[PDB]
Amino acid sequence: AVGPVADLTITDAAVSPDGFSRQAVVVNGVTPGPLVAGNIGDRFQLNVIDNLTNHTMLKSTSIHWHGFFQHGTNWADGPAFINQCPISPGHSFLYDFQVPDQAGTFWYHSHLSTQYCDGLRGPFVVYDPNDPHASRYDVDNDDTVITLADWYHTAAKLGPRFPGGADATLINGKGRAPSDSVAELSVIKVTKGKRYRFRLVSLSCNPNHTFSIDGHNLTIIEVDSVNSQPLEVDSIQIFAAQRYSFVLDANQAVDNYWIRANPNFGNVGFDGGINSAILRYDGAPAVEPTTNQTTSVKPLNEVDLHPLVSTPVPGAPSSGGVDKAINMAFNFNGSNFFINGASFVPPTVPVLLQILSGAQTAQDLLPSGSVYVLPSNASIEISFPATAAAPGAPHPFHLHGHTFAVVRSAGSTVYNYDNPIFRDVVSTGTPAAGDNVTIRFDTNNPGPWFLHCHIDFHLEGGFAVVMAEDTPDVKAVNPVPQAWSDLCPTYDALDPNDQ
Ligand SMILES: *[C@@H]1O[C@H](CO)[C@@H](O[C@@H]2O[C@H](CO)[C@@H](O[C@@H]3O[C@H](CO[C@H]4O[C@H](CO[C@H]5O[C@H](CO)[C@@H](O)[C@H](O)[C@@H]5O)[C@@H](O)[C@H](O[C@H]5O[C@H](CO)[C@@H](O)[C@H](O)[C@@H]5O)[C@@H]4O)[C@@H](O)[C@H](O[C@H]4O[C@H](CO)[C@@H](O)[C@H](O)[C@@H]4O)[C@@H]3O)[C@H](O)[C@H]2NC(C)=O)[C@H](O)[C@H]1NC(C)=O
Ligand SMILES: *[C@@H]1O[C@H](CO)[C@@H](O[C@@H]2O[C@H](CO)[C@@H](O[C@@H]3O[C@H](CO)[C@@H](O)[C@H](O)[C@@H]3O)[C@H](O)[C@H]2NC(C)=O)[C@H](O)[C@H]1NC(C)=O
Ligand SMILES: *[C@@H]1O[C@H](CO)[C@@H](O[C@@H]2O[C@H](CO)[C@@H](O)[C@H](O)[C@H]2NC(C)=O)[C@H](O)[C@H]1NC(C)=O
Ligand SMILES: *[C@@H]1O[C@H](CO)[C@@H](O)[C@H](O)[C@H]1NC(C)=O
Ligand SMILES: [Cu+2]
C-alpha cells in the first residue's frame, strides 16, 4: 500500500488486463491503482501529480476519495466543478484531509467526466487498530483486497454514450474477454485454517456484479465503511461503488476454487473463465479450478443488514417525519438524464467557489435548478422513486459527505426506522417492483455535496444534483489552501485541447 502521505502520479500508459492492449489512465503505473491505506485518525496528504498527455482520456483530472466525510475539507472531495476545478496537466495538487471518525473500505477515482472508466480508480482502506470485528479473522492486508472493475476495449469518449456491458470483468485487475481465452487470471491465495477479512470493492463504472466463491460461505461484517452485524451469505450482489467486508474461513480442502463476479449485462456467465478469478489454497496445483457453482441459497438482501452498534435513524418514524423531505423525479430523453426537470451541466465556477464568493441560496447558485440548499443540523429524507422514465435501472445513487440510513431498500416495501443499515451508495431498484428507495441523514457537514447515479455514463448524462448544506457556514468551516485557489485560474488558462 501507499499513504497516508504519498505521491499518486497519473499518466497515460498501455495496459492489457485481459490480453487486449489499450491506452488507459494509470496511477503509479497501474490500473486499478495501488491500494492507498492508513488508520483511523490519520491525516492523508495525497499529492496527485498530473502527468497526463492524452486529451481523449482528458489531460486534466480530479480525484474523489469515495466515502470520506471530508468535514472541514470540502475542497478536497473531488467532484470537478462542484468542489474544485480540475488539476491541470503538468501540475500537482495536494489533497490534505483527515479521517477522524471512520474506518473501513473505501476507494478513490477520477471525478472528472467519465475518466475513471478509462482507468483512474483504486482501493483505499482505513484500518482500525481496535476493530470490533478483529476477533472474527486472522488476516487483513494488501492481499485481502478484492477489486471488481468493468473493462472496455474502447475508451470512454470513443465508444457508445451508454455502453451495453463491458468487454471483461476484472477481479484484482485481471480477467478474460472473448478475444483471449487464456489470459492470466487473478489468484487470491489463502492458507488452510486461516480466516480472511476480504474487502470487496466495486470500482465499476456501470454494471453490478453478483459475487460468489465456489464451496465457501461469506460473513459480511462491513457495508460501505459501516460495521455491520455479521450476516452469513453465499452470494453478494454489489453495485457500482459499494464495498463489503466479508470473512472467509479457508477451511475447505486444499484446492482451487472459482471466484465469480457475474455482471448484470454484457458477457454474462463463465464460458472460458470470464467473470472469474481463482481462490488458491497454499499447496494446490497452479491450475484452473474445476469447481462448480452451486445455487445461491442465502443471497445478500440489504434489509437483512444492520449496524453493529445501535445507530439511530434521523427524524421520526413516519413518512416525511423529518425536517426536510425531497423527492427526486427522474426523466431521460435518450441522451440526458434529469432530476426534477434539470439535467446537470457542470458550472464554470465550481459550486464551492461560488459559495466562497457569496452565493448561498438556490437562486444565486449555478447551475440553476440543480442545487438544493439544506438547513443545518436537520434531518433530511430523500426518495428516489423508480420509474420507467429513467432507463438503465437499477441506478445506484451516491451521496457525498455523508452516510445515510436506508429506510426503504430496493425490493422491499418496509420502512425501517429502527435498525436499518447505513451506507453511502444505494440501489434505487426498478419500476417493475414499484420501488421507492428512501434514505435519511442529518446535516452536520457544511458544504456542497454531490448526489448522483454512480453509473459514470449516467452521471455524464446529467444524472446528478448538488446538496448545498449549511451555506452560511461553508466558508468558515472549510478554509481553502492556496493550491486549491490556484486550480481554477490554471485550468481556465488551458487551451481546450489541453483539458
Ligand atoms: C489517446 O487515448 C485514446 C483512447 O484510449 C487512444 O485511442 C485509440 O485510438 C486508436 C486510433 O483511432 C484506436 O485504434 C484502433 O485500435 C484497435 C484495437 O487495437 C488493439 O488490437 C490490435 C489488433 O490486435 C490483434 O493483433 C495483435 C498482433 O498484431 C495481437 O497481439 C492481438 O492479440 C490481436 O490478435 C493491436 O495491434 C493493438 O495494439 C496496438 O495498440 C495498442 C494501443 O491501442 C498498443 O498498446 C500496442 O502496443 C499496439 O501498438 C491494440 O491492442 C484496432 O483494431 C483498430 O484498427 C482497426 O481499425 C482501423 C481504423 O478503423 C483500421 O484502419 C485498421 O486496419 C484496423 O482494422 C484501430 O487501430 C484505439 O481503439 C483507441 N483506443 C481506445 C482504448 O479506444 C489514443 O490512441 C491515445 N493516444 C495516444 C497517442 O496513444
Ligand atoms: C454454506 O451455507 C449453506 C446454507 O446454510 C450450507 O448448506 C447446508 O449444508 C448442509 C451440508 O453441509 C446440508 O445438509 C446436508 O444435506 C445433505 C443432502 O440433503 C444430507 O445428506 C446431510 O445429512 C445434511 O443434512 C444443507 O441442506 C445445506 N443447507 C441449505 C442448502 O440450505 C453449506 O453447508 C455451507 N457451506 C459451507 C462450506 O460451510
Ligand atoms: C415515493 O416516496 C415519496 C416520499 O414519501 C412520495 O412523495 C410524497 O408523496 C405524497 C403523496 O403521496 C406527497 O404528499 C408528498 O409531498 C411527497 N413527498 C415529497 C415530495 O417529499 C412519492 O410519491 C413516492 N413515489 C412513489 C412512486 O411511490
Ligand atoms: C435531451 O435533452 C438535452 C438536454 O436538455 C438536449 O440537449 C438533447 O438534445 C436531448 N436529446 C435527445 C436525444 O432528444
Ligand atoms: Cu465514488
Ligand SMILES: [Cu+2]
Ligand atoms: Cu444510473
Ligand SMILES: [Cu+2]
Ligand atoms: Cu460523486
